[PDB]
Amino acid sequence: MDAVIKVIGVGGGGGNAVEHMVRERIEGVEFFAVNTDAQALRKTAVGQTIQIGSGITKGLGAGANPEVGRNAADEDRDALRAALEGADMVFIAAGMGGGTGTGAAPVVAEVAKDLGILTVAVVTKPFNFEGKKRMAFAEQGITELSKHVDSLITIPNDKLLLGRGISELDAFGAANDVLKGAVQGIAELITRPGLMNVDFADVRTVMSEMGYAMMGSGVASGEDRAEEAAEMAISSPLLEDIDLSGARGVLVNITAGFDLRLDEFETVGNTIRAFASDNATVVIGTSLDPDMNDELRVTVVATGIG
Numbered sequence: 039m040d041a042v043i044k045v046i047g048v049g050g051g052g053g054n055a056v057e058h059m060v061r062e063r064i065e066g067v068e069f070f071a072v073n074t075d076a077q078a079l080r081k082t083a084v085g086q087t088i089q090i091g092s093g094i095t096k097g098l099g100a101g102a103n104p105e106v107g108r109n110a111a112d113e114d115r116d117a118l119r120a121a122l123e124g125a126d127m128v129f130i131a132a133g134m135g136g137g138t139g140t141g142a143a144p145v146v147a148e149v150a151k152d153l154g155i156l157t158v159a160v161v162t163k164p165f166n167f168e169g170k171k172r173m174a175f176a177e178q179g180i181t182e183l184s185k186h187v188d189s190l191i192t193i194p195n196d197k198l199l200l201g202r203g204i205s206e207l208d209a210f211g212a213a214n215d216v217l218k219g220a221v222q223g224i225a226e227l228i229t230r231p232g233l234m235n236v237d238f239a240d241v242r243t244v245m246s247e248m249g250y251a252m253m254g255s256g257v258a259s260g261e262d263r264a265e266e267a268a269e270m271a272i273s274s275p276l277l278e279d280i281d282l283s284g285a286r287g288v289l290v291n292i293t294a295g296f297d298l299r300l301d302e303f304e305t306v307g308n309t310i311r312a313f314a315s316d317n318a319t320v321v322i323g324t325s326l327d328p329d330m331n332d333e334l335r336v337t338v339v340a341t342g343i344g
């Protein structure tokens with residue numbers, strides 16, 4: 039009777055983000071890597087892999103065009119459907135701007151949508167330094183992805199992060215952490231509830247067919263940890279341009295250890311409701327992380343923003 043939650047990394051960037059999720063852990067989800075790149079699929083620690091297309095490139099540099107990723111996913115739509123069938127929720131992670139993520143992520147999303155599965159995408163846009171062509175590919179793919187998902191969180195790499203000692207691996211680590219934070223913050227309300235369990239219908243109510251979304255998070259310890267974590271999440275760099283009262287939905291995850299108090303649940307809810315609209319749907323849940331002592335995290339997902 040447990041929830042079935044699948045997290046799909048599409049292409050190299052998305053596969054890299056999901057590999058980070060595997061290393062850092064998200065409780066109770068199943069991880070998949072979808073890629074045209076057969077070598078990436080051999081190397082990945084992600085437990086389930088799905089090859090799309092033949093895995094043989096028919097032209098030098100051809101794999102950078104989103105049409106190749108789209109055509110590859112379309113050729114293997116049966117394998118995508120068979121992997122997704124039976125899920126209660128699917129997350130799609132991609133770095134937009136390449137050929138595979140950009141082109142194949144909207145195909146994966148539509149397969150999930152057509153199966154009736156609540157589908158949330160968490161994707162990045164390329165750094166400005168990657169050039170206008172990749173940015174144009176990324177934005178065109180986000181237009182297409184937005185037609186096939188219930189909620190879309192778009193993280194511009196330019197907003198997150200460059201200087202000495204910061205490698206390319208380090209630069210994408212920041213994006214990986216945000217993508218993980220969004221997937222973890224939503225999924226773990228279902229897979230590892232604390233004293234106030236959210237009901238999945240409430241997750242569906244604030245995420246199904248909602249459109250654009252954005253996440254912020256905060257963490258605090260001490261006597262006032264609950265209000266402080268919530269205030270930090272609302273003031274997070276990703277929510278700075280977003281008024282929470284313009285969000286048709288708000289989903290909130292309070293994560294902490296065994297001591298999470300009902301009065302802390304009430305405090306967080308009071309804080310979030312102070313910022314949210316009365317003409318919206320608000321959902322506050324908790325997750326239990328037995329390894330957390332003192333610390334309390336609040337993750338806020340504003341949905342239906344525009």
Ligand SMILES: Nc1nc2c(ncn2[C@@H]2O[C@H](COP(=O)(O)OP(=O)(O)OP(=O)(O)O)[C@@H](O)[C@H]2O)c(=O)[nH]1
Pocket residue numbers: 048049050051052054055074101102103132133134135136137138139140162163164165168172195210211213214
């Ligand atoms: N999080 C993360 N993002 C990456 C990584 N590498 C590249 N990106 C970003 O994701 C975008 C797409 O890059 P890739 O994923 O490698 O391209 P892809 O979708 O596999 O498609 P192709 O390589 O063209 O076949 C890039 O333009 C970068 O902005 C990575 O290792 N981790």
